[PDB]
C-alpha cells in the first residue's frame, strides 16, 4: 500500500475484530462501509406526516408560533400513510430496480425516505434529496385527497416551511441530518453539521459507537475540505483508526486501566504507552531532571495523544455522569499533557483551543449552549480538524440527565427514524467488516 502502517481493529466491547489491517483499509477513500454511510447520510430524509397533518389542521404554518386563521385544512394523512408512502416511492424512484427506500416509522407518523443514488449522481449537491422528497410528499398528499387549488399551497407550506421567503426550510415538517449548504460556516463542512445529541440518538447512547460515528464523519469531512491531502493524510487516517475506531484496543485499555482514575492518571498511562511503543523519545534532560520529549513519528504521536484525549473524556465525564465537564476535560487533558512532556498536544493545540472556546460558550451569557448542541459546523467547535467532537459524542452518551437541552429535547425522534440503519448505529463493527473486504486489494 501507500503507507506501511497496519493496525488491529477492536470492537466497542474491547474484543478483536480484524487482525493486521493496512491503515488505508479504514480510509474514507477506500472503505466501502464509510462510502455507504456517507451516501446514506446525504440521501436520507425524515418526513413528519403527523407534523404535516397537525400544521395543516391548525394552519400552524411556517415556524414557531405562526398560525394563519381561516386557512386550516383537515386531512387524514397519518391514517393513509401507506398509500401516501407508495406514491412517494413512485415519484422519488428512477426505476423499480434502484436503491430508493421508503420506510414508515412510529405507526405511520414519520417516513424515512432514502432518495436513489441516481438522483444524487446528476445533482450538484445533497439538497436534492430533501427537495425531491418534499415535492413527492406535496403531490402525494394533494393527489391522495384531491386537495383543491386554493388549499394546495398550504400543503406545500406545511411540508417545506417558509421557503423561499426564508433561505432554508424554516418551520418545515421534513428534516435531514445535513442542513443546506447556504448555512455552512466553512467550505466542505456539510458532513460536520450533525449535532452531538443526534449522534448519541442514532447510536442509541452507546459511548464508543457514538464517538466512532462522530470521528468517521469528522475525518471524512477532513478529506472533503482538502485538509487530509498530501502531507497531512496519514495524520487524519491514524486519527480515525486510533481515536475513532479503537485501533490496537488502545482507547479501550486506557479507559479500563483508569476506570477509578483521573485525567492526570490517563495522561500518565498514555505517555508510558507512547514511550514503550517508541512513538516518542527523550530530546533533552533539563537541570531539574525534567525530560523534554520529541515525537519519533509526528502523525502517530498525534494519534496516540488523541486516543488518550477521548479516554480522558470517558473517564472524567464518566465519573461525573454529567456531560458539562467535557469541554474542561478536553482543555486540561491537552494542557497537562504538554507540560508533562514538552510535546505538542492533540491537533497541535487546536483541540485545546477548541475546548477553551467550547468551555466559555457552555458556561457564559454570550452564545453556545449545552454540549449536546455543538458540531463541527458550529463557529465554536469547528477549529480542531476532527479530534474534538468525538469527545462530545462520548460525553453526551454518559450524561445521566443533567441537561436541559438533552437528547430527548433536541433529538427526540432521531433514534426512531435513523438508528435502525446498521452502519449508523454500529459503525465500528461494520467499518471493520468493510476493512476486511478490501484489506487484500490495497
Amino acid at each position: 500500500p501507500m503507507y506501511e502502517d497496519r493496525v488491529d481493529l477492536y470492537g466497542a466491547d474491547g474484543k478483536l475484530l480484524e487482525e493486521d489491517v493496512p491503515l488505508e483499509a479504514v480510509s474514507p477513500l477506500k472503505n466501502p462501509t464509510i462510502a455507504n454511510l456517507v451516501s446514506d447520510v446525504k440521501r436520507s430524509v425524515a418526513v413528519n406526516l403527523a407534523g404535516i397533518e397537525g400544521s395543516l389542521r391548525k394552519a400552524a404554518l411556517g415556524g414557531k408560533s405562526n398560525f394563519i386563521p381561516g386557512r386550516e385544512v383537515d386531512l387524514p394523512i397519518v391514517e393513509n400513510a401507506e398509500a401516501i408512502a407508495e406514491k412517494i416511492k413512485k415519484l422519488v424512484q428512477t426505476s423499480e430496480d434502484d436503491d430508493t427506500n421508503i420506510r414508515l416509522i412510529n405507526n405511520g407518523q414519520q417516513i424515512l425516505v432514502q432518495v436513489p443514488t441516481t438522483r444524487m449522481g446528476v445533482a450538484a449537491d445533497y439538497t436534492v434529496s430533501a427537495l425531491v422528497t418534499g415535492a413527492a410528499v406535496v403531490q402525494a398528499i394533494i393527489d391522495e385527497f384531491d386537495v383543491d387549488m386554493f388549499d394546495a399551497n398550504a400543503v406545500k407550506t406545511a411540508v417545506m416551511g417558509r421557503y423561499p421567503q426564508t433561505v432554508d426550510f424554516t418551520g418545515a415538517n421534513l428534516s435531514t441530518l445535513l442542513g443546506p449548504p447556504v448555512l455552512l460556516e466553512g467550505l466542505g463542512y456539510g458532513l460536520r453539521n450533525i449535532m452531538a445529541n443526534h449522534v448519541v440518538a442514532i447510536t442509541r447512547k452507546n459511548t464508543l459507537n457514538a464517538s466512532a460515528l462522530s470521528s468517521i464523519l469528522e475525518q471524512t469531512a477532513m478529506f472533503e475540505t482538502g485538509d487530509a491531502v498530501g502531507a497531512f493524510e496519514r495524520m487524519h487516517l491514524l486519527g480515525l483508526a486510533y481515536q475513532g475506531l479503537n485501533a490496537n484496543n488502545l482507547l479501550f485499555d486506557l479507559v479500563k486501566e483508569n476506570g477509578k482514575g483521573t485525567v492526570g492518571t490517563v495522561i500518565a498511562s498514555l505517555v508510558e504507552r507512547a514511550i514503550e511503543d517508541r512513538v516518542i523519545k527523550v530530546a533533552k534532560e533539563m537541570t531539574s531532571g525534567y525530560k523534554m520529549y520529541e515525537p519519533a513519528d509526528w502523525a502517530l504521536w498525534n494519534a496516540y495523544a488523541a486516543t488518550g484525549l477521548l479516554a480522558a473524556t470517558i473517564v472524567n465525564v464518566g465519573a461525573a455522569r454529567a456531560a458539562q465537564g467535557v469541554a474542561s476535560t478536553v482543555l486540561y487533558y491537552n494542557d497537562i499533557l504538554e507540560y508533562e512532556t514538552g510535546l505538542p498536544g492533540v491537533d497541535f493545540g487546536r483541540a485545546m483551543g477548541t475546548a477553551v472556546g467550547f468551555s466559555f460558550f457552555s458556561h457564559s451569557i454570550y452564545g453556545g449552549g449545552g454540549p449536546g448542541i455543538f458540531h463541527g459546523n458550529h463557529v465554536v467547535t469547528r477549529h480542531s480538524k476532527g479530534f474534538a467532537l468525538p469527545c462530545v459524542a462520548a460525553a453526551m452518551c454518559l450524561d445521566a440527565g443533567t441537561q436541559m437541552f438533552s437528547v430527548e429535547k433536541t433529538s427526540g425522534l432521531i433514534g426512531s427514524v435513523y438508528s435502525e440503519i446498521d452502519y449508523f448505529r454500529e459503525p465500528i463493527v461494520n467499518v471493520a467488516k468493510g476493512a476486511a473486504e478490501i484489506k487484500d486489494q490495497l
Binding site: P69, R71, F150, N153, Y163, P164, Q165, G369, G370
Partner: protein, 548 residues
C-alpha cells in the same frame, strides 16, 4: 362622492378636475416650491463646511417644475405636504417606524423558567418575574448589574429602551407588575383577546426593545444578541446565580435560538443582511406589526393602514435605499397612501363585494376571483380616464397599476378569505390593466405579474408559498417597486374581513400593542403625516453627547 375629489380640488385649485387641458412652463421652475427654495438655501449655506466641493444645485440637470409641483394629502388625514417631506431621509417618523421594528425581539420565558426550577432548583413566582423585569429595565439600556468597575451607557440617550412581558395565562397576568405588562385583555377587543389567548395558551413572553441609537449605529442583527446578553445578566442578578456556570448557557441558547421570535429572517448572499432587516419581514408579519386591526373593524381601513406602513417600509426604505439608493422611490410608495385614491378604489370594491357576495360570503373559486378583480380594475381605470387631474397625480404607470391591483386583490380577499386568491386577483388585474391602456409600469415592473398567475397557486419548490408568508425575498418579488406594500395589504385583507386578531403570529401582534412605542402603529398614516409636518420627535439622537 369619490373619495379622492377633495384632494384633487385642493391640489388643482382654480382648475376643473375633469378638464383635459392646462397651462405649463409658467411656474418659475423650482422657485414655485417652498421646499425646493429651502433646499437651495441650505445648499448655499453648506458651501463653507464643504470647503469648495460642489453640492445640490437646481441648475444641474433637469429644470424641475415645468409642470406644477404637487402637494399630497396623506390619506385619512388633513395634512397636505410636498412630496419631499415624505422622503424617508427627510421624514423622522418613517425612520422611527423602521427603527422600532428593527429594535424589537420577543423571547419566550417558559424555558428559562424551567432551567431555573429543573436545573437550578430555584423557584419562579410572580414576584420573582416582577423583580427580573425591573432588573432588565436597568440592564437592557446599558446599566451594569454584576461586575465592579463597569462603564455604562448614558441613560439620557437610551430612554426609549425597555422591556415588557405578556402572557396568555390570565391568572399570571393579574399578578404581574402593570408598569411592565402588555395586557392582552386591555389592548384588544374581547373577541380578539379571546382568539389571541387560545393560540398563545399558558405561555409567557418578554418583549425587548433595544435602544434606537444601537440599531442606527449598528444593524438589525445586533438586536437578538443585545436582548439575549442582557436577559442573561438579568437572570444572573435577579435570581442570584453564580455569575458564570453551565446552566447560564441554557438561557443563552433559549434567548438567541430556541425561544426567540425575530421580526425578519436572513437574506441570501447576493443581498446579504442579518435578521431584523426589512427584506426579511414577511408580509403577514408586517400586517401583524401594524395595530389598525385592533382599533378598527373596517376591513378596508385596516388593510389601507397596513399598506401605508408597508409602502414606507418596503418601497421607500427597503427597495429605495437598502437595495438601490439616491433620490429613491418616494412617490412609487406615496401613490398608495395619499390623496384617498387607493381608498376610493378599495371602498368601491368592498361595497361591490358586500352587495354581490357578502364579506366572507364566498368560498375561493376562479369565477369569483375573475368577477371581482375585473370589476374593480375596470372601475379603477375609469377613474383615471374620467379625471385628467387624477391621472396627472398618479403620473407613473407603475403607481396606477399598483393601486388598481391592490384594490382588486384586497377586494377578492374580502369576499373569499383567501390571500392567495387575493394575489391571483392582483395578477389578473395587472394583465387586464396592461391590455386596456397598452402600457403598465416601468421597464421591469411586471416581471412578477407575468409569472404571477402561475406561481400564485403553485405548489412547487420556490414557487408555492401561502401568501401571508411571502415577503421581499420570495424570488419573483425580490427586485421591483409597486408590489410589496400592496401585498402586505392583501395579506391583511382576508383576516380583516374575518375579524381575526392577527394574520400570521399572535406573539407579533401582541408585541406591538404598546403605547410606549415611539411610532404609532395603530395608524401609520397619521404618524407618517406627523413626520411630514416635522412634528414627530424620534429616538436615538445624540444631542446629549455632542457640543451645544
Amino acid at each position: 362622492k369619490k373619495l379622492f375629489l377633495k384632494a384633487l380640488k385642493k391640489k388643482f385649485e382654480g382648475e376643473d378636475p375633469e378638464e383635459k387641458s392646462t397651462n405649463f412652463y409658467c411656474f418659475g421652475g423650482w422657485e414655485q416650491s417652498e421646499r425646493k427654495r429651502e433646499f437651495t438655501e441650505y445648499a448655499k449655506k453648506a458651501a463653507e463646511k464643504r470647503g469648495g466641493i460642489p453640492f445640490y444645485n437646481p441648475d444641474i440637470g433637469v429644470p424641475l417644475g415645468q409642470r406644477k409641483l404637487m402637494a399630497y394629502r396623506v390619506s385619512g388625514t388633513d395634512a397636505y405636504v410636498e412630496g419631499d417631506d415624505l422622503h424617508f431621509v427627510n421624514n423622522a417618523a418613517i425612520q422611527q417606524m423602521v427603527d422600532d421594528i428593527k429594535r424589537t425581539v420577543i423571547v419566550g420565558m417558559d424555558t428559562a423558567h424551567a432551567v431555573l426550577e429543573k436545573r437550578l432548583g430555584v423557584e419562579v413566582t410572580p414576584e420573582t418575574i416582577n423583580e427580573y423585569m425591573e432588573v432588565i429595565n436597568h440592564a437592557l439600556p446599558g446599566g451594569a448589574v454584576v461586575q465592579e468597575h463597569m462603564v455604562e451607557v448614558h441613560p439620557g440617550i437610551v430612554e426609549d429602551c425597555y422591556a415588557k412581558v405578556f402572557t396568555g395565562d390570565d391568572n399570571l397576568a393579574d399578578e404581574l407588575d402593570k408598569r411592565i405588562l402588555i395586557d392582552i385583555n386591555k389592548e384588544f377587543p374581547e373577541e380578539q383577546a379571546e382568539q389571541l389567548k387560545s393560540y398563545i395558551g399558558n405561555r409567557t413572553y418578554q418583549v425587548n426593545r433595544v435602544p434606537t441609537i444601537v440599531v442606527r449605529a449598528c444593524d438589525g442583527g445586533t438586536v437578538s444578541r443585545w436582548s439575549a446578553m442582557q436577559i442573561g445578566m438579568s437572570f444572573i442578578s435577579a435570581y442570584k446565580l453564580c455569575a458564570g456556570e453551565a446552566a447560564i448557557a441554557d438561557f443563552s441558547f433559549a434567548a438567541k435560538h430556541a425561544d426567540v421570535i425575530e421580526m425578519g429572517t436572513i437574506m441570501p448572499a447576493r443581498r446579504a443582511r442579518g435578521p431584523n432587516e426589512p427584506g426579511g419581514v414577511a408580509f403577514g408579519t408586517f400586517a401583524d406589526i401594524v395595530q389598525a386591526s385592533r382599533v378598527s373593524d373596517d376591513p378596508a381601513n385596516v388593510s389601507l393602514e397596513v399598506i401605508a406602513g408597508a409602502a414606507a417600509l418596503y418601497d421607500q426604505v427597503w427597495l429605495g435605499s437598502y437595495m438601490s439608493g439616491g433620490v429613491g422611490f418616494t412617490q412609487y410608495a406615496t401613490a398608495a397612501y395619499t390623496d384617498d385614491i387607493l381608498d376610493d378604489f378599495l371602498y368601491y370594491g368592498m361595497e361591490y363585494v358586500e352587495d354581490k357576495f357578502g364579506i366572507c360570503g364566498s368560498e375561493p373559486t376562479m369565477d369569483v376571483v375573475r368577477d371581482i378583480s375585473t370589476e374593480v380594475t375596470l372601475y379603477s381605470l375609469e377613474q383615471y380616464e374620467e379625471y385628467p387631474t387624477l391621472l396627472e397625480d398618479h403620473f407613473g404607470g407603475s403607481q396606477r397599476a399598483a393601486v388598481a391591483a391592490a384594490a382588486a386583490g384586497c377586494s377578492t380577499a374580502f369576499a373569499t378569505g383567501n390571500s392567495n386568491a387575493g394575489v391571483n386577483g392582483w395578477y389578473l388585474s395587472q394583465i387586464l390593466h396592461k391590455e386596456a391602456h397598452s402600457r403598465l409600469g416601468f421597464y421591469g415592473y411586471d416581471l412578477q405579474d407575468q409569472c404571477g398567475a402561475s406561481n400564485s397557486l403553485s405548489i412547487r419548490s420556490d414557487e408555492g408559498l401561502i401568501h401571508e408568508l411571502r415577503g421581499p425575498n420570495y424570488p419573483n418579488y425580490a427586485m421591483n417597486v409597486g408590489h410589496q406594500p400592496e401585498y402586505a395589504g392583501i395579506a391583511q385583507a382576508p383576516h380583516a374581513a374575518r375579524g381575526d386578531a392577527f394574520c400570521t403570529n399572535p406573539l407579533i401582534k401582541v408585541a406591538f400593542a404598546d403605547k410606549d412605542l415611539s411610532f404609532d402603529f395603530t395608524s401609520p398614516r397619521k404618524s407618517i403625516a406627523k413626520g411630514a409636518l416635522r412634528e414627530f420627535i424620534p429616538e436615538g439622537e445624540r444631542d446629549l453627547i455632542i457640543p451645544a
